[PDB]
Every structure is written in C-alpha cells, then in structure tokens.
Amino acid sequence: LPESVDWRAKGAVTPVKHQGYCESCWAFSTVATVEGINKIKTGNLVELSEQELVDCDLQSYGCNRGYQSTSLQYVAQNGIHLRAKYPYIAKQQTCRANQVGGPKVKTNGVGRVQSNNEGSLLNAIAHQPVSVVVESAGRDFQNYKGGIFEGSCGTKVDHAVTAVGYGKSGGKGYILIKNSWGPGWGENGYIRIRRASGNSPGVCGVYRSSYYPIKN
Known about the structure:
Blueprint: E1 5-6, H1 25-42, H2 50-56, H3 68-78, H4 97-100, E2 109-112, H5 118-125, E3 130-134, H6 139-142, E4 148-149, E5 159-169, E6 172-178, E7 190-194, E8 211-214
Parallel strand pairs: 4-7
Antiparallel strand pairs: 1-5, 2-8, 3-5, 5-6, 6-7
C-alpha cells in the first residue's frame, strides 16, 4: 500500500532470536508472523513458542527442516503457547502442548503469496509480517553485517525468514527481514535485501515461497 512499512516501529516485532545449532528456521519464521498478526488483531505483543512447533508439528522434522505451510497450519488448528511456558531447547523433544497448557494464541487460516512477484509480496507485507524463503548458503549472506544486500546469492533457497517491512533508501527498494541467527548478525539480526531486479524469483530467491497466518 504505502511507500514504506516497518512493523517493528508499529510495535509488532519481538527481539531477534537464536535458532542455535538446530535446523528450525521454519519454526522461527512462523512464530514471528503469528506474534505479528496477534498484536495487529489484538494489540498484544507476546512471544510464542518455536519449541512447540519443533516438537509438535508432525509433518515437519523438528531440528531437521520443516515446512512453512504445515507449521502455519499447526497454529491454525491447535493454537500455540507462550514462549515462557514452552522454552526453546534447540533439540526436538516430546510434544508438550497438552501438558504445557492447551491452546493460547490461535489463528484460523494460512495464506500463500502469489509466487515470483514483487507486487503481491509488498501488498502482503503491507498487511502484516510474512514468512519468506531465501538462499542463505553463500559466504556473502553468511558474513553480511549491513546495508542493502544486492547479493552474490543464487536462488537455491534454504532458509525461512520473516519479511517485516520494505522501503526505499538511496534510490533502491528493499525488503526488511528478521533473521534468527541472533543480534550479532547483519544489522542487529536484520537484513535489507535489494528488491525485484527484472527476475521475479527475486534477489536470493526471496520471491519463491511466502506464507502468512490468517486471523479472521
């Protein structure tokens, strides 16, 4: 919708987290999009549990990769608990949802953005935080510590992150993304990746698989 967005400024984004040594980026990004839509709908910003999804999403593989849609679908079906009540342990344990406290923040649906298209992605970010995919394998993404990432990445996505805003700074458009590698990476745990570029799969394949929780 507008020339710029930043959900952190509107108070819809929680602190940058650490996945640690576990392949749970899918769980991290989906929680960030849900904390985002809850605050948007509810006015309440609370941290939710990536651990519950890690142990509880049975379509995904805990600390060995998982899905955007299946974790988003888990919350739509069962709701999700508070982070403080179901602590992150960086290892897949037995599902504690029923023992922890049965459903807390719940959504009712899950949407996937029309793929390979700048316009649709911005329209979705304009409404709330979106779960996006990016190729993080490279050394430039890896040792990134600041500015608008033009790249040196291909499109072989391998990481789910959270698109929290977009804008233009110095002539260039960008997508503001919340990464889960702690505050010691990029711009305090964040990365501005250059946007679009003639190729619709996007920079570092950021236009490939974008999902958002739907709260009716």
